[PDB]
Amino acid sequence: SQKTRDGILDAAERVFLEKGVGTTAMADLADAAGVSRGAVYGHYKNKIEVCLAMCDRAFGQIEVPDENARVPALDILLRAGMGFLRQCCEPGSVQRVLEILYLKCERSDENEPLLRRRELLEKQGQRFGLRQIRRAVERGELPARLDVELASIYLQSLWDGICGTLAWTERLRDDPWNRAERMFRAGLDSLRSSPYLLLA
Amino acid sequence: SQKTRDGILDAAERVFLEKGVGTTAMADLADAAGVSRGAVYGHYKNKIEVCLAMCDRAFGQIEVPDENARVPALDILLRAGMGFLRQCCEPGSVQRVLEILYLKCERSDENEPLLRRRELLEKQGQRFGLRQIRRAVERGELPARLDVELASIYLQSLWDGICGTLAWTERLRDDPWNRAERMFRAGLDSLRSSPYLLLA
Numbered sequence: 001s002q003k004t005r006d007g008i009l010d011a012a013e014r015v016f017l018e019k020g021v022g023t024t025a026m027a028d029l030a031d032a033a034g035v036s037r038g039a040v041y042g043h044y045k046n047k048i049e050v051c052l053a054m055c056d057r058a059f060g061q062i063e064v065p066d067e068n069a070r071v072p073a074l075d076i077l078l079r080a081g082m083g084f085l086r087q088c089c090e091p092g093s094v095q096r097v098l099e100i101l102y103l104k105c106e107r108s109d110e111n112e113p114l115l116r117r118r119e120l121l122e123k124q125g126q127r128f129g130l131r132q133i134r135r136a137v138e139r140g141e142l143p144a145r146l147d148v149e150l151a152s153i154y155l156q157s158l159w160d161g162i163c164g165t166l167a168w169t170e171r172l173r174d175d176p177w178n179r180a181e182r183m184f185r186a187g188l189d190s191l192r193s194s195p196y197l198l199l200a
Numbered sequence: 201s202q203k204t205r206d207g208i209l210d211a212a213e214r215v216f217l218e219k220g221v222g223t224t225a226m227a228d229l230a231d232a233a234g235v236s237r238g239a240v241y242g243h244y245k246n247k248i249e250v251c252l253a254m255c256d257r258a259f260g261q262i263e264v265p266d267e268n269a270r271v272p273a274l275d276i277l278l279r280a281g282m283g284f285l286r287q288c289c290e291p292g293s294v295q296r297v298l299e300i301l302y303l304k305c306e307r308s309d310e311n312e313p314l315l316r317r318r319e320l321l322e323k324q325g326q327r328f329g330l331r332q333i334r335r336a337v338e339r340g341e342l343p344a345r346l347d348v349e350l351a352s353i354y355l356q357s358l359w360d361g362i363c364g365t366l367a368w369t370e371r372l373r374d375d376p377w378n379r380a381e382r383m384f385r386a387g388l389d390s391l392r393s394s395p396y397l398l399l400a
Contacts, residue, residue, distance in 0.1 A: 153362070153371055154383050160364055161357025171353055182396040183354050190390040196382040 008033040008040055009054045013096040021051060021114065022106040048113060055117055058097040062087060067131070072141050074188055077132035081159060082181060089166045129155060133191070142191055147199040151191050158187045208233040208240055209254045213296040221251060221314065222306040248313060255317055258297040262287060267331070272341050274388055277332035281359060282381060289366045329355060333391070342391055347399040351391050358387045 011033035015024050026047045030040045044050045065080040087094045101118050105111055129152050136142040162180050165171045172179055191197055211233035215224050226247045230240045244250045265280040287294045301318050305311055329352050336342040362380050365371045372379055391397055 150379060150382065153365060153379075154358075154386065157361025157365055157383065158354075158358050159361070161359070161361035162353070164360055165353060165357055179350060179353075182350065183357065186354065186390045186394040186396040189394045189396070190386045193393065194386040194389045196386040196389070 002043070004033075004035055004039065005043055007035060008043070008050060009057055010093070011035075012050055012054045013058075013093055013100065016051065016054070016100045016104060017096055020104045020106060021047075021100070021111060022108055026050070048110065052113055052117060055097055055101070055114075058093045059121070061092065061094050073132045073135040073139055074141060077129065077136075077155075078181075078184055078188065080128070081155075081184060082177075085159070085163065085166075085180065086177070088163065126152070126156065136191075143198060145198050145200075146191060147197055151197055154191070154197065155187055158183065202243070204233075204235055204239065205243055207235060208243070208250060209257055210293070211235075212250055212254045213258075213293055213300065216251065216254070216300045216304060217296055220304045220306060221247075221300070221311060222308055226250070248310065252313055252317060255297055255301070255314075258293045259321070261292065261294050273332045273335040273339055274341060277329065277336075277355075278381075278384055278388065280328070281355075281384060282377075285359070285363065285366075285380065286377070288363065326352070326356065336391075343398060345398050345400075346391060347397055351397055354391070354397065355387055358383065 008029055012029055015029055015032050018024075024047060026040060027037050029047065029050060030037045033040065040050070044053065063080075063083045065076050065083070067076065069076065088098055089095060101114065105114055107115070130148070133142070133146075133148055133151055133155070137144055137146050137148070162172070162183055166176060166180075208229055212229055215229055215232050218224075224247060226240060227237050229247065229250060230237045233240065240250070244253065263280075263283045265276050265283070267276065269276065288298055289295060301314065305314055307315070330348070333342070333346075333348055333351055333355070337344055337346050337348070362372070362383055366376060366380075
């Protein structure tokens, strides 16, 4: 029975992608899903509910890197940034959801729980990076007296920057993935060997 | 008489900022402007017209760096990127206009001329950077066999990245301007001393 549960969520990704979350209604879900208006309701209370639930399934799909593997911390930092970026711009459920969440989700008071979930993602992330760079210095891989904070701001900016050039421009339409990786690596060097990122 | 011309444009920046360009109408301009509906019409045909005109005044306000000054080309590249970023996030007419143009301007077929103007800005810019980095290598300031294209993609990403952290987060709410400059400089080093940005 709960297999039909999948039917609405994947149903939903499209519905929400097709029209915004504020304008989409609970019947229209059952339509695209193929189910009866009651069925959908059975499993869920509100469309908002169906929505949080669709977002969870899709975060369980984000690959979790192994924070504790015998490699350089920056090797972990990069792999994740490269795995994750991939998922944002390849064509699975995760890329859908994020596009739903950021673009097709109004700032109403109703979408508060959506908004919160989102920021949770943003923070979970921003902090993960902050952990990796921290370790690198501690692990000797990067200059003690590296200005950690500004450093993240640097990496985090760079990411977002190329994120916006994949979607949406044709600048990395040719070989994208080895190239981004080059940019990321080159981003990581500057932490390593660049004066202006140390403190005081 | 044409001094009232200013009155509508500055009038406009607010009106368009207040409600989008698609929803704003030509009477409402005269309202905020203080002028009569006929006056506004006298100087301009369409609201779209008033709008292109508002955008021009505000691009004449973008500082043009001296492409031909006896300094390093990257000194020119940075100054401009630092002057210009400033104008996007300090509180003059230019910052208004851009916010109007990017956020509060629908993708309708009507706003085509607006859209075009915009991209013109984007291209004028992207090309300016491409000129500066080009020169640097030619001028010996950067590795011949530097992969020019990927390099810009790198700088252009980084910019956009910090642009999005000024607006909109509190991450550079403390000292922003010396810090961004640090990031930019550190961005420029990586072109200089980073393997992954050369070709072949």
